[PDB]
Ligand binder design. Structure first.
Ligand SMILES: Nc1ncnc2c([C@@H]3O[C@H](CO)[C@@H](O)[C@H]3O)n[nH]c12
Ligand SMILES: Nc1ncnc2c([C@@H]3O[C@H](CO)[C@@H](O)[C@H]3O)n[nH]c12
Lengths: 237, 237, 237, 237, 237, 237
């Protein structure tokens, strides 16, 4: 066990999907995994391990924000043999042409956190995903008839920002989605020598206030999970 | 309701105690509150409302890290009429004379987060608790015969810090405990116009491991909760 | 002697009250101290030692600005056995409800100086007063029937600031008074191992001019000095 | 014309290859392009436009360093309709497993320049390539029997850095090559809404030392240019 | 009058010499000026006006540190018609070849203060003297047979620095003397459209602990004052 | 030889003039030097060595931007015995009184580059010229009937700056010319113990607009080179 995960080596697969919401980890395990067992419940951060098309896969919540997800991803990598993290989450859009229910793949993640400056001698660390994992996710989405956008996320420390002006800056520089984790996960992956990827579905538009039907939103969420799971199978080959 | 709290105005008391762990909020509601009802379970972040000695009191987890607790404390302040937040958490000691299970009251909170620089035009915002709440907690602790040290916490973004030498700097400057929230809660309280206090118990020593037993953790946790609850009653006078 | 104080160990009491203006130190010695003797005049920075109600007390100017007061407070701590420093100064208000001649107690001090970043590895050091000294000043003020607000000061490097908009940010974050020393004194106290408190009277309003008379300044100055001196007597118990 | 390019709209292809050494532009034009014409000569920064397998391609040097290449890439994008920039350069390696003459593709670029902080309100902009361009280069290299590594470059402002220890940090965080341009090119591409990619060959191992032959270096340079040119054809699908 | 100078327009000459120590301003006026009158005594910061070889000249202390001298120099420029400030002070040496009693002229001043970053949008403002004033001082020193060194000063915020390492950095980059004011005076001069110069005598060596005779030190101090006064006469022609 | 200069010790004079445009080096050699010989050609950065009135002088371009000119000036100082660098370039003006074709001498250079913060532990290094070189240029200009302005340049990293408002700040603080090199050259000179000077002619007024003739621009360039060369002879006293 580690300070935030009451489990032993082998309880997790070498790939872990991670939503922010632990109740979504339970949702994913029940919906997509066969023979799924709960393997962590410390602090309510439910984690599960099962199989997808015979392949051992884990899913566990990471909580909200860079500090929370940095704890869980570190401990998985250093003590549970985890080689790949796929964050599966929601994000807010700032670009007009990025629509509700688009699937966004974060090849990079900008941030207003200081954690990577702390790692990188106060210089600019480009927080990036693993290229092969990005390619696997693009290819899995194509096989499913979903065309994902690949680009930069912005990982914010303040969901309730005082700086409304920063959203115009994100739009100017082409940020595809705003979430709260990717840059921290990518920093952990680089620090501890593992691989990570963040996929998000667009849940909100800071530009055009608008909302679709729940059935359509939930379909797209499941499409993101299918993309993540099928991308693992591609990487295995 | 708000994006992370499925409740309505009136469901929360005007004072909310907040551990990081939602399961500890459940324990506090079951152990210390009469007629406790669950008022939130979104993302598993359990929150409850009941009475302590006739006084309406709420307790809700805030998750780990400044970004997580900033979400919950903001929404409580802006949409649920919450006037006082008392974080009741754990922390790690860097000072040799600060012992396991000591109670620490954070009159100020240092941090390596950027959130207060974003608020404060990149200058030094001294993230401080409400003085009256600090005095109430000191007095409540004295009435219970519990020692309590008052001073600075350090709110870290990285539990697994790559900069071990910074602990020497914390120690040099008298930091009483390392946790991950106080400076963010104090920044939210100032931004959104409420009052806050962080109380912690020393759960680990960052230099010396110092293992504790389960029965000792519960006694000291209960002591911290008693201090917080009794401090509310003092402030009501 | 030290580079800026021509005195020897024992010439100062273990508590030193410090206005910015050396002429105010002379006035304090003449008005409040019995058997006062001058113990320093290097650079005209007048310092005196006498007794208040039998208690040995010193009073010495510290000059204007963090660099100036950091010199004097350091040398007092390291070479003259000084244990407590009480700055007794003036400040400018930014909050509409903070009135001229109000007494403000700086439990914390914000700043735009770099001195604490230099100390604290470029992170946020919360520059705080000693809690017991804060409580002593609150209690002494209550015993004298004088109102006193407790909260954050802002210690500015530029009295003539080129950034007028920053006063809106100070006001937003509840800053009670703008002065030029507290955050530096609190940083010295932490660095060199002593205790400090800043008390100020609102001498000007940064928005509204608000002129005062000479007799009102003296009464309120005397009130601040009485609070400081009586707070020492409370701390001795 | 623009301040640094004496040409008119249409004189450049929508894709420009850019070496750092201006002498390589004429070499690339004569060796790889058909029907090349001269389109710029100001400051000796010769530019040429021709075709590769029928596809219009331009080539022009960018000069050493982020400020130099930022000038040329901006003017090409805003006044010459350029949609894709491929930098073709050399880099130094810090990783033991990265060998001399290896081909490195910069999906991201770290930097110690301030240019992207100036752009991005002093936050962390992840300077990234266009994903399709990255994959095109990977696939073109594979078709040529060259395995390319994809990851982070580091774009240095100081070739002669006074901070040797930063190379250890680069190694820890997996930096594949050190050059002086990619992060600046990627920032320009994001600022003005275009696409860019940096491909480098390893010319030195910064912390070890060993050499190659002139014929080996020419073969490897030619390989890089073939990868770049064939990658464009793949992008045209 | 201004908040820190109780005088009226005309009471000061259009050139003011400024030592840090107000008792030194009295020393300079009595030693070098004819018909000298005291024109300020607020906060004990003595200022005087007299004639040197028939030329109207003022001398007034500026206190220790950038915040103190920034107050006095601003108020002189904006409200007393002062066109030129000459700081005349002491400094500590870090270079081996810079000796006790050398005269140093600060054509530039480095600093660890934040005041110029506040003025200059967090970029690097090169805090420089007025060229003509530098040339006048060099020429006056030559006429007196003193060969002054012209170069960079370092203006420190902390006389008692915690960062001993910075002195090696100053030596590496050729800093001639360490004092506490020049960069702030030069920032004020630029902000308010006036001219300034700092001259110092070397009073201490952070390298070679050593001291000369008082008679020789005082001779060199008077040489610095003569250089400053004669340089004004050169500028007048 | 060095990585960017294929020459040996003695091939360069101890004084090197450096334009930004590499084509100007050959022009300066043919127009002003006697007996010139070619001493470098790598990357097309032609260097020449000859004599001016019997005095050995070299000329070689430095490329655009701080990183480019930092490479060449470092290698000249550390491997070719170069003692003085004179940059001879153009700049844009922000002050209304600074006219097209004015000669500006940069006694200091502000910057938005990070290179000197990297050198100087993130403090403010005042990037300054050598004083004697400044005065030599002023005196040589006066002997040629040219009045030169001496003050601060601003060395920009982005010719195409996204922050137009910074030009207002430059104007307020008296910046004479905007170019892209001086602060970097001055930092190298300080780092490696040599001397440097930047002279520029005003080629544009950034916030207004108007033009000159080709013959006027050639006359003004020739004037600048004559000033530079005659200033060297004055320095040799
Ligand atoms: N040495 C330590 N360091 C950082 N945080 C903590 C904590 C607290 O517990 C959580 C991490 O375990 C987090 O919410 C933090 O506030 N306990 N001990 C800690
Ligand atoms: N509006 C104001 N702003 C900044 N400082 C002060 C002060 C205090 O008085 C001095 C400046 O007049 C200085 O020591 C500072 O602490 N009073 N009013 C102030």
């Amino acid at each position: 066990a580690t300070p935030h995960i009451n489990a032993e080596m082998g309880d997790f697969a070498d790939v872990v999907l991670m939503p922010g919401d632990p109740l979504r980890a339970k949702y994913i395990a029940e919906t997509f995994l066969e023979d799924a067992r709960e393997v962590n419940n410390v602090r309510g951060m439910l984690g599960f391990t099962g199989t997808y098309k015979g392949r051992k896969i884990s899913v566990m919540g990471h909580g909200m924000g860079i500090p929370s997800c940095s704890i869980y991803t570190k401990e998985l990598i250093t003590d549970f043999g985890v080689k790949k993290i796929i964050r599966v989450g929601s994000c807010g859009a700032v670009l007009p042409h990025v629509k509700l229910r688009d699937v966004v793949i974060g090849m990079g993640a900008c941030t207003d956190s200081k954690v990577n400056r702390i790692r990188f001698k106060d210089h600019d660390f480009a927080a990036i995903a693993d290229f092969d994992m990005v390619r696997n996710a693009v290819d899995a989405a194509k096989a499913l008839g979903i065309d994902a956008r690949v680009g930069n996320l912005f990982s914010a420390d303040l969901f309730w920002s005082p700086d409304g002006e920063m959203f115009d800056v994100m739009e100017k520089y082409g940020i595809l989605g705003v979430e709260m984790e990717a840059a921290g996960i990518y920093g952990v992956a680089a620090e501890f020598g593992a691989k990570a990827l963040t996929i998000c579905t667009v849940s909100d538009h800071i530009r055009t206030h608008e909302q679709t039907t729940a059935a359509e939103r939930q379909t797209t969420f499941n499409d993101m999970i299918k993309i993540a799971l099928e991308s693992v199978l591609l990487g295995d080959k």
